[PDB]
């Protein structure tokens, strides 16, 4: 029993984190085989962080301008290039701890584990969802750029996020590992703002199923709704529309609990219309949308 925000074990990623320094600018890099990946913001100077021309900045650098450190072991840079908002620094040593991995671009609503790092040293691990407005609600300070988000399948690490920046509302923006930003954001300190966000409906339903699996049943009712009538209510409360594909992904959960998806949508509707009346679900007085259906199965089945 129990249901927690649970990260993947971070060991395989800790062994890939390095420190990258250019002048007085430092951040984290990801060391896979003989390539270190890091945000190109490391070549930005403190005086021109507003309008950097990174192509210019990069031409003016040489390999020896990049200080890469795996702990105390200094890694010599022997080649450099820029792909979108990430730098690829070729080093003379392949990381002997490189895991099986892939670079993937995740969709809004999917979750991943963040290994927050400073000066190349892992400091903490937590779960995040990619919000519909393409930000994440992380916990990041100066020096955290280059920390990565990932999922693990068997022993294969899927890197999906590299951290770059913080937006004015205190949420976080970054790229995939090919350097393409999630969301309409850019790696410079100009005026930028997160778009309006929405709640991930399929995840709230997943978490209601988790709640039932853990014995919370007070929010169930004998009613059912149509998908169209539910989406009518969802729009009113700024929830993403629920699609037939979402209903299908919730199948294993409905099957295990015996609660049809549209029966649970009737519970969600009542919770949206009336609130919780002082009760809690899995320890929360708010409807939680940062667990996917997959996250619930992983934790309630213990994979």
């Amino acid at each position: 029993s129990g249901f927690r925000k649970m990260a993947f074990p971070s060991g395989k990623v800790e062994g890939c984190m390095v420190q990258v320094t250019c002048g007085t600018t430092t951040l984290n890099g990801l060391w896979l085989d003989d390539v270190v990946y890091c945000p190109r913001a490391v070549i930005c100077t403190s005086e021109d962080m507003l309008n950097p021309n990174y192509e210019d900045l990069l031409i003016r650098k040489s390999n020896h301008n990049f200080l890469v450190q795996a702990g105390n072991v200094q890694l010599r840079v022997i080649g450099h290039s820029m792909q979108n908002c990430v730098l690829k620094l070729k080093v003379d040593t392949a990381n002997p701890k490189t895991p099986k991995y892939k670079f993937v671009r995740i969709q809004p609503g999917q979750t991943f584990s963040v290994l927050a790092c400073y000066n190349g040293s892992p400091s903490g691990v937590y779960q995040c969802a990619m919000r519909p407005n393409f930000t994440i609600k992380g916990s990041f300070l100066n020096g955290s750029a280059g920390s990565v988000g990932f999922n693990i399948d068997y022993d294969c690490v899927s890197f999906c996020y590299m951290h770059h920046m913080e937006l004015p509302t205190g949420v976080h923006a970054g790229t995939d590992l090919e350097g393409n930003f999630y969301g309409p954001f850019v790696d410079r300190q100009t005026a930028q703002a997160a778009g309006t966000d929405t709640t991930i409906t399929v995840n709230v339903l997943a978490w209601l199923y988790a709640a039932v699996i853990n014995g919370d049943r007070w929010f169930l009712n004998r009613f059912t709704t149509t998908l169209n009538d539910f989406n009518l209510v969802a729009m009113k409360y700024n929830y993403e529309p629920l699609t037939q594909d979402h209903v299908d992904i919730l199948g294993p959960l409905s099957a295990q609990t015996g609660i049809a998806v549209l029966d649970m949508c009737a519970s969600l509707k009542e919770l949206l219309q009336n609130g919780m009346n002082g009760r809690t679900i899995l320890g929360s007085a708010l409807l939680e949308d940062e667990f996917t259906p997959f996250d619930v199965v992983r934790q309630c089945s213990g994979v």
Partner: peptide
């Protein structure tokens, strides 16, 4: 507001 690039100082 402006974005903050969260590199650090050495």
């Amino acid at each position: 507001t402006s974005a903050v690039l969260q590199s650090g100082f050495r």
